[PDB]
């Protein structure tokens, strides 16, 4: 309740760079970062690649 | 070819003009029927001729293919890519026979399956 | 003379290849992903639409 995420958004909008949050708390499956193998049908890449696809830039604010 | 009802109607007509007009009407109706049947038949005959000509065009393509074509030339893109990739490498014989066996299994399997993709992955 | 009148060959041609190529025309893209994309596209042309490998290839390339 201090505004960490809010100030992250404020920095993202002030710098003009895109924004994307990521919840790692209590996580155990590394595939969320490193994705799947692309082999098993429906396999998805790491959520960072998803962020790059969505924000459409290589200088976002993750 | 008008039905007997039309002939009875023509007979019922008394005035020569009226009966002659009805007879000419029936002649025109017969012309309509014959022309419609002929048009349908000719269109279907043209379509079936094109259907046979489709196999004929496939045959012409096949002969051009024989002159220069893909058949008579077995292909395996992954095979060739990996062979050229390892060609420059001074590669041990053990791994070479392992790769040969892996590629033979890859060819032995479909190009659509999970084990195919896993074999590809290991080969990569 | 091969391309005279044949329905099956005409379809599935220059539909996804050119689409991806134009999708990459605007990007400053590294050589590695160029060569990967080129090989993947060449295969994609060598494959058919029904293929599960074709579907996985399209997913990864997209």
Tab-separated table of C-alpha atoms in Angstrom:
chain	number	residue	atom	x	y	z
A	1	UNK	CA	0.000	0.000	0.000
A	2	UNK	CA	2.863	2.388	-0.754
A	3	UNK	CA	2.486	2.831	-4.525
A	4	UNK	CA	5.303	0.699	-5.952
A	5	UNK	CA	3.224	-0.545	-8.885
A	6	UNK	CA	1.627	2.886	-9.270
A	7	UNK	CA	5.025	4.586	-9.461
A	8	UNK	CA	6.116	1.896	-11.920
A	9	UNK	CA	3.193	2.887	-14.152
A	10	UNK	CA	4.026	6.566	-13.636
A	11	UNK	CA	7.630	5.968	-14.712
A	12	UNK	CA	6.461	3.943	-17.715
A	13	UNK	CA	4.184	6.744	-18.907
A	14	UNK	CA	6.658	9.549	-18.133
A	15	UNK	CA	9.486	7.805	-20.003
A	16	UNK	CA	7.059	6.980	-22.873
A	17	UNK	CA	8.217	3.343	-22.715
A	18	UNK	CA	5.660	0.551	-22.619
A	19	UNK	CA	4.623	-1.160	-19.387
A	20	UNK	CA	4.134	-4.784	-18.371
A	21	UNK	CA	3.844	-6.385	-14.928
A	22	UNK	CA	4.863	-9.894	-13.902
A	23	UNK	CA	3.791	-11.878	-10.827
A	24	UNK	CA	6.550	-14.227	-9.648
A	25	UNK	CA	5.322	-14.694	-6.067
A	26	UNK	CA	4.908	-18.291	-4.965
A	27	UNK	CA	5.797	-19.415	-8.488
A	28	UNK	CA	7.661	-22.664	-9.136
A	29	UNK	CA	7.214	-23.357	-12.862
A	30	UNK	CA	10.239	-21.825	-14.587
A	31	UNK	CA	8.445	-22.237	-17.930
A	32	UNK	CA	6.680	-18.921	-17.280
A	33	UNK	CA	10.050	-17.230	-17.885
A	34	UNK	CA	11.746	-19.727	-20.212
A	35	UNK	CA	8.559	-20.901	-21.933
A	36	UNK	CA	7.899	-24.420	-23.149
A	37	UNK	CA	9.812	-26.336	-25.834
A	38	UNK	CA	7.461	-25.260	-28.677
A	39	UNK	CA	7.181	-29.000	-29.358
A	40	UNK	CA	4.125	-30.050	-27.356
A	41	UNK	CA	1.169	-28.644	-29.281
A	42	UNK	CA	-0.201	-25.623	-27.462
A	43	UNK	CA	3.199	-24.987	-25.877
A	44	UNK	CA	3.634	-21.279	-25.178
A	45	UNK	CA	6.846	-19.222	-24.922
A	46	UNK	CA	8.070	-17.360	-21.874
A	47	UNK	CA	5.879	-14.546	-20.617
A	48	UNK	CA	8.694	-12.112	-21.453
A	49	UNK	CA	8.297	-12.992	-25.135
A	50	UNK	CA	4.567	-12.404	-24.672
A	51	UNK	CA	5.370	-8.997	-23.173
A	52	UNK	CA	7.630	-8.186	-26.122
A	53	UNK	CA	4.856	-9.196	-28.527
A	54	UNK	CA	2.240	-7.101	-26.715
A	55	UNK	CA	4.264	-3.964	-25.935
A	56	UNK	CA	5.786	-4.174	-29.444
A	57	UNK	CA	9.125	-2.711	-28.314
A	58	UNK	CA	12.522	-3.820	-27.027
A	59	UNK	CA	12.574	-0.986	-24.452
A	60	UNK	CA	9.500	-1.659	-22.294
A	61	UNK	CA	9.141	-1.205	-18.535
A	62	UNK	CA	8.725	-4.738	-17.200
B	1	UNK	CA	-45.122	-33.059	-77.980
B	2	UNK	CA	-47.832	-31.148	-76.119
B	3	UNK	CA	-49.983	-33.275	-73.837
B	4	UNK	CA	-53.363	-34.575	-74.967
B	5	UNK	CA	-54.985	-31.799	-72.923
B	6	UNK	CA	-53.422	-29.172	-75.191
B	7	UNK	CA	-54.654	-31.034	-78.275
B	8	UNK	CA	-58.150	-31.170	-76.774
B	9	UNK	CA	-57.961	-27.429	-76.098
B	10	UNK	CA	-56.928	-26.802	-79.712
B	11	UNK	CA	-59.818	-28.953	-80.940
B	12	UNK	CA	-62.213	-26.984	-78.729
B	13	UNK	CA	-61.210	-23.825	-80.602
B	14	UNK	CA	-63.712	-22.972	-83.341
B	15	UNK	CA	-62.249	-20.014	-85.241
B	16	UNK	CA	-59.438	-20.960	-87.619
B	17	UNK	CA	-57.279	-18.046	-86.349
B	18	UNK	CA	-57.666	-19.058	-82.695
B	19	UNK	CA	-56.890	-22.742	-83.264
B	20	UNK	CA	-53.914	-21.893	-85.477
B	21	UNK	CA	-52.569	-19.472	-82.866
B	22	UNK	CA	-52.882	-22.152	-80.183
B	23	UNK	CA	-51.124	-24.685	-82.426
B	24	UNK	CA	-48.291	-22.233	-83.101
B	25	UNK	CA	-48.191	-21.556	-79.354
B	26	UNK	CA	-47.729	-25.265	-78.695
B	27	UNK	CA	-45.017	-25.396	-81.362
B	28	UNK	CA	-43.213	-22.516	-79.633
B	29	UNK	CA	-43.617	-24.255	-76.264
B	30	UNK	CA	-42.099	-27.408	-77.764
B	31	UNK	CA	-39.247	-25.271	-79.094
B	32	UNK	CA	-38.734	-23.885	-75.587
B	33	UNK	CA	-38.623	-27.383	-74.101
B	34	UNK	CA	-36.290	-28.798	-76.751
B	35	UNK	CA	-33.924	-25.822	-76.564
B	36	UNK	CA	-33.862	-25.955	-72.755
B	37	UNK	CA	-33.076	-29.678	-72.785
B	38	UNK	CA	-30.403	-29.159	-75.446
B	39	UNK	CA	-28.819	-26.279	-73.522
B	40	UNK	CA	-28.660	-28.299	-70.304
B	41	UNK	CA	-27.238	-31.296	-72.149
B	42	UNK	CA	-24.619	-29.259	-73.995
B	43	UNK	CA	-23.538	-27.416	-70.845
B	44	UNK	CA	-23.166	-30.697	-68.952
B	45	UNK	CA	-21.285	-32.238	-71.887
B	46	UNK	CA	-18.890	-29.285	-71.910
B	47	UNK	CA	-18.426	-29.615	-68.147
B	48	UNK	CA	-17.668	-33.347	-68.351
B	49	UNK	CA	-15.310	-32.699	-71.269
B	50	UNK	CA	-13.507	-30.212	-69.025
B	51	UNK	CA	-13.512	-32.839	-66.268
B	52	UNK	CA	-11.739	-35.323	-68.542
B	53	UNK	CA	-9.461	-32.538	-69.776
B	54	UNK	CA	-8.518	-31.922	-66.136
B	55	UNK	CA	-6.977	-35.387	-65.943
B	56	UNK	CA	-5.532	-34.652	-69.389
B	57	UNK	CA	-3.879	-31.485	-68.045
B	58	UNK	CA	-2.610	-33.477	-65.072
B	59	UNK	CA	-1.073	-35.896	-67.582
B	60	UNK	CA	0.502	-33.032	-69.543
B	61	UNK	CA	1.918	-31.640	-66.303
B	62	UNK	CA	3.176	-35.142	-65.523
B	63	UNK	CA	5.036	-35.387	-68.833
B	64	UNK	CA	6.522	-31.907	-68.381
B	65	UNK	CA	7.462	-33.120	-64.899
B	66	UNK	CA	9.166	-36.143	-66.467
B	67	UNK	CA	11.096	-33.768	-68.727
B	68	UNK	CA	11.892	-31.691	-65.626
B	69	UNK	CA	10.106	-32.362	-62.359
B	70	UNK	CA	10.134	-33.194	-58.682
B	71	UNK	CA	9.513	-36.949	-58.963
B	72	UNK	CA	12.535	-39.240	-59.485
B	73	UNK	CA	14.220	-36.955	-56.896
B	74	UNK	CA	13.799	-38.116	-53.305
B	75	UNK	CA	13.957	-35.200	-50.876
B	76	UNK	CA	14.428	-34.666	-47.149
B	77	UNK	CA	15.017	-31.041	-46.159
B	78	UNK	CA	15.967	-31.736	-42.536
B	79	UNK	CA	18.322	-34.506	-43.671
B	80	UNK	CA	20.201	-32.263	-46.098
B	81	UNK	CA	20.274	-29.286	-43.726
B	82	UNK	CA	21.790	-31.313	-40.890
B	83	UNK	CA	24.208	-33.094	-43.238
B	84	UNK	CA	25.550	-29.777	-44.522
B	85	UNK	CA	25.609	-28.412	-40.966
B	86	UNK	CA	27.807	-31.305	-39.796
B	87	UNK	CA	29.821	-31.523	-43.034
B	88	UNK	CA	32.327	-28.816	-42.092
B	89	UNK	CA	32.618	-30.221	-38.567
B	90	UNK	CA	35.342	-32.792	-37.956
B	91	UNK	CA	32.783	-35.166	-36.490
B	92	UNK	CA	33.405	-38.497	-34.700
B	93	UNK	CA	32.118	-41.708	-36.248
B	94	UNK	CA	29.998	-42.634	-33.214
B	95	UNK	CA	27.920	-39.455	-33.384
B	96	UNK	CA	27.787	-39.813	-37.174
B	97	UNK	CA	26.173	-43.249	-37.010
B	98	UNK	CA	23.912	-41.984	-34.217
B	99	UNK	CA	22.765	-39.112	-36.447
B	100	UNK	CA	22.296	-41.490	-39.385
B	101	UNK	CA	20.115	-43.767	-37.256
B	102	UNK	CA	18.164	-40.788	-35.913
B	103	UNK	CA	17.501	-39.528	-39.448
B	104	UNK	CA	16.493	-43.020	-40.584
B	105	UNK	CA	14.004	-43.190	-37.707
B	106	UNK	CA	12.815	-39.682	-38.598
B	107	UNK	CA	12.088	-40.834	-42.142
B	108	UNK	CA	10.504	-44.032	-40.815
B	109	UNK	CA	7.990	-41.904	-38.875
B	110	UNK	CA	5.317	-39.504	-40.057
B	111	UNK	CA	5.930	-35.756	-40.333
B	112	UNK	CA	3.050	-34.960	-38.000
B	113	UNK	CA	3.641	-36.631	-34.624
B	114	UNK	CA	5.044	-35.781	-31.210
B	115	UNK	CA	7.814	-38.386	-31.387
B	116	UNK	CA	8.799	-36.957	-34.771
B	117	UNK	CA	9.161	-33.509	-33.218
B	118	UNK	CA	11.122	-34.924	-30.270
B	119	UNK	CA	13.483	-36.763	-32.630
B	120	UNK	CA	13.906	-33.514	-34.560
B	121	UNK	CA	14.591	-31.687	-31.293
B	122	UNK	CA	17.263	-34.161	-30.189
B	123	UNK	CA	18.835	-34.053	-33.650
B	124	UNK	CA	18.959	-30.255	-33.418
C	1	UNK	CA	3.999	-24.303	-69.106
C	2	UNK	CA	3.496	-26.033	-65.746
C	3	UNK	CA	1.324	-23.112	-64.571
C	4	UNK	CA	-1.505	-23.267	-67.108
C	5	UNK	CA	-4.697	-24.323	-65.296
C	6	UNK	CA	-4.649	-26.356	-62.064
C	7	UNK	CA	-6.722	-25.522	-59.006
C	8	UNK	CA	-4.799	-27.301	-56.257
C	9	UNK	CA	-1.353	-25.842	-56.974
C	10	UNK	CA	-2.663	-22.269	-57.202
C	11	UNK	CA	-3.989	-22.272	-53.630
C	12	UNK	CA	-1.787	-22.031	-50.519
C	13	UNK	CA	0.817	-20.027	-52.478
C	14	UNK	CA	2.247	-16.632	-51.500
C	15	UNK	CA	-0.337	-16.303	-48.712
C	16	UNK	CA	1.638	-16.741	-45.474
C	17	UNK	CA	5.187	-16.525	-46.856
C	18	UNK	CA	4.719	-13.001	-48.201
C	19	UNK	CA	2.648	-12.014	-45.163
C	20	UNK	CA	5.453	-12.865	-42.736
C	21	UNK	CA	8.067	-11.342	-45.052
C	22	UNK	CA	6.219	-8.015	-45.133
C	23	UNK	CA	5.639	-8.287	-41.381
C	24	UNK	CA	9.438	-8.415	-41.000
C	25	UNK	CA	10.202	-5.710	-43.584
C	26	UNK	CA	9.749	-2.908	-41.032
C	27	UNK	CA	11.991	-4.471	-38.368
C	28	UNK	CA	15.754	-4.247	-37.945
C	29	UNK	CA	16.169	-7.977	-37.455
C	30	UNK	CA	19.321	-9.989	-36.581
C	31	UNK	CA	20.909	-12.452	-38.995
C	32	UNK	CA	20.215	-15.528	-36.856
C	33	UNK	CA	16.449	-14.992	-36.913
C	34	UNK	CA	16.637	-14.177	-40.642
C	35	UNK	CA	18.232	-17.531	-41.417
C	36	UNK	CA	15.879	-19.372	-39.048
C	37	UNK	CA	12.867	-17.659	-40.647
C	38	UNK	CA	14.116	-18.376	-44.167
C	39	UNK	CA	14.659	-22.076	-43.477
C	40	UNK	CA	11.342	-22.340	-41.624
C	41	UNK	CA	9.501	-20.620	-44.485
C	42	UNK	CA	11.180	-22.839	-47.080
C	43	UNK	CA	9.966	-25.870	-45.139
C	44	UNK	CA	6.509	-24.335	-44.704
C	45	UNK	CA	6.253	-24.170	-48.479
C	46	UNK	CA	7.423	-27.791	-48.622
C	47	UNK	CA	4.667	-28.791	-46.155
C	48	UNK	CA	0.885	-28.979	-46.475
C	49	UNK	CA	-1.823	-27.156	-44.543
C	50	UNK	CA	-3.197	-30.257	-42.790
C	51	UNK	CA	0.171	-30.979	-41.184
C	52	UNK	CA	0.465	-30.745	-37.417
C	53	UNK	CA	4.117	-29.874	-38.004
C	54	UNK	CA	2.892	-27.182	-40.408
C	55	UNK	CA	0.616	-25.817	-37.674
C	56	UNK	CA	3.406	-25.841	-35.073
C	57	UNK	CA	5.707	-24.190	-37.615
C	58	UNK	CA	3.143	-21.474	-38.316
C	59	UNK	CA	2.634	-20.896	-34.588
C	60	UNK	CA	6.361	-20.621	-33.863
C	61	UNK	CA	7.003	-18.432	-36.906
C	62	UNK	CA	4.124	-16.104	-36.019
